[PDB]
Design a protein around this nucleic acid. Structure first.
Lengths: 410, 314, 217
DNA sequence: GGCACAGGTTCAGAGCAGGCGT
DNA sequence: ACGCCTGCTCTGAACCTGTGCC
């Protein structure tokens, strides 16, 4: 009687979505036994069992619905309801996440067993169709994986194979949708960093970006799809740009904190070597981005801003070596190396890119226009400022450790 | 030359009356400090007193650096033995009190203490401060001049404790480098655990401190991660200190309760979830209490028409 | 009393309620003592953000504490408690109290209540600590608040102030660090009364802080 | 041509980075 | 070089446009 009417079903679905959304906003939902957390925990898990089973038992490829009713596909909605459940149990019932997976041995093994299902579902979604793929259901599978990924223990085998698989999906598949691509790379980094520094990764993305977008000089050979496959004309240009430089920032956040704690002190030698190795690797990252023909939005601003922040960390570093190097005779071949590349490869290409972007010149409320353009005129100078203040502490360094570091600089 | 272990204190009471330079007083007291190691504990306090009254015309940095570095080592060794308590608590205390009665007459003593216990850069705060340094500070909050200065340091440090560790626990690169030195909530709580042997001065500072953190970092952004979590975490702490404090010190748990009620009652001008959530777990652990504090809940009810509903309910 | 309850729980015009509020305060002289408390709460629930000085000013004049004399002291305590609970809960009231004492710096005949309130408000409310001490110096410099007041406060209102032990002495310590023997005289007399009337702990704190002066000051 | 989601934009203020008196 | 004041940077909220689809 009820199974015949499809509308009746997508009612009692929408109802369930409304209940779980209500539980997020206030610690409790609407009706009776909607305050007693025990009973809500009971039901959530009892709802979960069935919603999981529907999606399991019935895929989205068995539809006879068309676009209007695939916008509210009974499959799709049950994954959105999953997403909020997995979400909002971590908000409240983080203790009973074991009892929660006992409904579906420690927490991590159950995690993996439950992951594989969605993983394979997503993979079948993606691999099968190209033409009119489920953007939404693929994307919020990605979102459920993201939410739940954070319950794996970071040294567990299941975490390792997750990341391997994660990066492997990013390495293989085409997938023209950018918000989709955005979500994957986000998940990749969020997983990756709590195993190690994500720096070669940033390098790799920049080399592919450099490959795809082209180059400033209008004659440099670049193509490197080989690294990571989910990077496009459309995708990398506004998006993987902001994210790859976003992830560089979190590098230099850590590096600023490193140097603050180091200058407190005066163990040291390994930490300096580590910092310089970091900086050297991501100076290759900055190299590939600079050579790129970056568009003129937040993409260009966030490169130039992060070149400032690269140079500012290099300023804190050089001014650090001045305090201490007077006492011994310091600057090991580590720092000489770094300074060499920051002069030889980095600084002059900073100039050729900013000059190219400002060379690039191809209805306006007067007040708003004045406010906008004189805001946007700061960062070409803040880069020339930041470079010349590097050169300052390098001339200071040259004198106050007895090494002429201006023999490198042009 | 070697000092008669018996009357080393009496020898150090003689350089009290001679006029000396810095180098001279420094030499004599750093030897009197080498001598704490090779003694019974119960005679260290009066020796510390006769060091401080000498240090009044000599080195203060040195006197208090010595007492701190010594008890820091002591408490760490007591900890890893646990992994002589019922008297180790008498000494730490009697000392904090003996250094109190001096910073009372010697306002420069306090300033040198405080300078010594600056965060500044967070790398000095991961070699400086302690489970003993902090009982000492949270006694010091009783001096009228000094309350405020002290608290402000503790509070601001508290946050960094969350911010280092939070930014640290984002990253594996950082966890590789730093060998994780116990963090600042832990320390403050180990004070509270120590507290039992009833050095009841520290308590004024705790309670003062505790509502400072929640009143400071309360939910009001919520009617990010950066400006959210190390303020909630801070709030949690406030709450955490007081509840643990309330469990231990039967004397205080009248005026924890009133000081809560105060902030609960007339507001909902500002949000107060946190205070009710504490108020729960206070009364959940040992609600005999409100039988002793009955006048005060009586005169929370005389505002229970003006109070908004979600508050009144809970 | 009950009338007050009823007119609180009926459905009315505010100007009417104001009118009757004054019909109290004109006869606030004339309440039987037991009943003082219960009124005063109403008056301080009958406060808006804008009604405040007016009402406190009249009341601050109207209220005696001299007139009111074992049930007496109990009822007085009840009083200060009720006030205590009010002032607890309206930042507007505490600040405004003090603005309507310092506007009565002019008549050097202002009364006992204008201490006891400060000390209370110092103890109770902390945001004001600087402000009471500013006012107390500025007012005592002026040839207002003196001996005859401070003597009278601690001869009858010890049991009120017993509680505010630490409050009096935070003050006394603030006053002796000054110039102007007028001020320091007051800060001393503070210590003498503090030590006469309070607990043994207060006595210890007196001699504690006296020493602190003697060795530093 | 109207109907609808996404972007960026201006705001509005919290809360701390850093120039400037003794 | 420590204390005091200000103004800048972040952060999210809400506003309304701007452009894609049927």
């Amino acid at each position: 009687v009820l199974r015949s009417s499809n509308e009746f079903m997508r009612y009692a679905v929408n109802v369930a979505l409304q209940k779980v959304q209500q539980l997020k906003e206030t610690g409790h939902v609407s009706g009776p036994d909607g305050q007693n957390p025990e009973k809500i925990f009971q039901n959530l898990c009892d709802l979960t069992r069935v919603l999981l089973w529907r999606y399991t038992s019935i895929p989205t490829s068995v539809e006879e619905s068309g676009k209007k009713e695939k916008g509210k596909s009974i499959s799709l909605l049950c994954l959105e309801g999953l997403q909020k459940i997995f979400s909002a149990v971590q908000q409240f019932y983080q203790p009973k996440i074991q009892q929660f997976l006992r409904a579906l041995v420690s927490v991590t093994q159950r995690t993996a067993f439950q992951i594989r299902q969605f993983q394979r579902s997503l993979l079948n979604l993606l691999s099968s169709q190209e033409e009119d793929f489920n953007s939404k259901e693929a994307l919020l599978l990605v979102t459920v994986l993201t939410s739940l990924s954070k319950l794996l223990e970071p040294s567990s085998p299941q975490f390792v194979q997750m990341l391997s698989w994660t990066s492997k999906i990013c390495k293989e598949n085409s997938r023209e949708d950018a918000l989709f691509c955005k979500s994957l790379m986000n998940l990749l980094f969020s997983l990756h960093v709590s195993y190690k520094s994500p720096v070669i990764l940033l390098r790799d993305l920049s080399q592919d970006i450099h490959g795809h977008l082209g180059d400033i000089d209008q004659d440099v050979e670049v193509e490197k799809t080989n690294h990571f496959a989910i990077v496009n004309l459309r995708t990398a240009a506004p998006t993987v740009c902001l994210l790859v430089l976003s992830q560089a920032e979190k590098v230099l956040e850590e590096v600023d904190w490193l140097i603050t704690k180091l200058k407190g002190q005066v163990p040291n030698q390994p930490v300096e070597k580590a910092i310089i190795m970091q900086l050297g690797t991501l100076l290759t990252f900055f190299h590939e981005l600079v050579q790129t023909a970056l568009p003129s939005g937040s993409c260009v601003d966030t490169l130039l801003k992060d070149l400032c922040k690269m140079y500012t960390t290099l300023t804190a570093l050089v001014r650090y070596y001045l305090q201490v190097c007077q006492s011994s005779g310091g600057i090991p071949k580590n720092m000489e190396k770094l300074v060499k590349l920051s002069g030889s490869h980095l600084t002059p290409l900073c100039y050729s890119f900013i000059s190219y972007v400002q060379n690039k010149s191809k209805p306006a409320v007067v007040a708003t226009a004045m406010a906008r353009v004189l805001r946007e005129t700061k960062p070409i100078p803040n880069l020339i400022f930041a470079i010349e203040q590097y050169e300052k502490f390098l001339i200071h360094l040259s004198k106050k450790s007895k090494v002429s570091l201006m023999q490198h600089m042009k | 030359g070697r000092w008669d272990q018996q009357y080393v204190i009496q020898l150090t009471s003689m350089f009290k009356d001679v006029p000396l330079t810095a180098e001279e007083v420094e030499f004599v007291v750093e030897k009197a400090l080498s001598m704490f190691s090779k003694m019974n504990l119960q005679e260290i306090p009066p020796l510390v007193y006769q060091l401080l009254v000498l240090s009044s015309k000599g080195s203060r940095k040195s006197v208090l650096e010595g007492i701190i570095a010594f008890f820091s080592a002591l408490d760490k060794q007591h900890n890893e033995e646990q992994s002589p308590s019922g008297e180790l608590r008498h000494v730490e205390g009697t000392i904090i009190l003996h250094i109190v009665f001096a910073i009372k007459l010697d306002y420069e003593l306090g300033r040198e203490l405080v300078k010594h216990l600056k965060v500044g850069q967070q790398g000095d705060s991961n070699n400086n401060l302690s489970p003993f340094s902090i009982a000492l500070l949270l006694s010091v909050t009783r001096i009228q001049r000094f309350q405020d200065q002290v608290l402000d340091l503790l509070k601001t440090s508290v946050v960094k404790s969350f911010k280092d560790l939070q930014l640290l626990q984002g990253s594996k690169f950082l966890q590789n480098l730093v060998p994780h030195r116990s963090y600042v909530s832990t320390m403050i709580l180990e004070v509270v655990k120590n507290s039992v042997h009833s050095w009841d001065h520290v308590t004024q500072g705790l309670v003062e401190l505790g509502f400072i953190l929640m009143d400071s970092y309360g939910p009001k952004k919520v009617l990010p991660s950066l400006s959210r979590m190390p303020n909630q975490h801070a709030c949690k702490l406030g709450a955490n200190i007081l509840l643990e404090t309330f469990k231990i010190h039967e004397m205080i748990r009248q005026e924890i309760l009133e000081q809560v009620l105060n902030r609960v009652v007339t507001r909902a001008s500002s949000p107060i979830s946190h205070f009710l959530d504490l108020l729960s777990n206070i009364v959940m652990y040992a609600p005999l209490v409100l039988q002793s504090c009955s006048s005060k809940v009586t005169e929370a009810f005389d505002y229970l028409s003006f109070l908004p509903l979600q508050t009144v309910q809970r | 009393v009950p009338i007050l309850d009823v007119l609180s729980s009926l459905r009315l015009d505010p100007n009417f309620l104001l009118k009757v509020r004054q019909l109290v305060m004109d006869k606030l002289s004339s309440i039987r003592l037991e009943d003082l408390p219960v009124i005063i709460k109403f008056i301080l629930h009958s406060v808006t953000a804008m009604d405040t000085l007016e009402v406190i000013s009249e009341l601050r004049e109207k209220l005696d504490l001299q007139h009111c004399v074992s049930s007496g002291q109990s009822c007085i305590i009840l009083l200060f408690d009720v006030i205590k609970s009010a002032i607890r809960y309206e930042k507007t009231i505490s600040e405004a109290w003090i603005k309507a004492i310092e506007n009565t710096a002019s008549v050097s005949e202002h009364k006992v209540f204008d201490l006891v309130m400060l000390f209370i408000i110092y103890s109770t409310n902390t945001q004001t600590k600087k402000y009471i001490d500013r006012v107390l110096r500025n007012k005592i410099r002026s040839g207002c608040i003196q001996e005859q007041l401070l003597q009278s406060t601690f001869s009858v209102h010890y049991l009120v102030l017993k509680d505010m032990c630490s409050s009096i002495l935070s003050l006394a310590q603030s006053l002796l660090h000054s110039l102007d023997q007028s001020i320091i005289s007051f800060g001393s007399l503070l210590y003498k009364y503090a030590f006469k009337f309070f607990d043994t702990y207060c006595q210890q704190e007196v001699v504690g802080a006296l020493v602190t002066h003697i060795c530093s000051g």
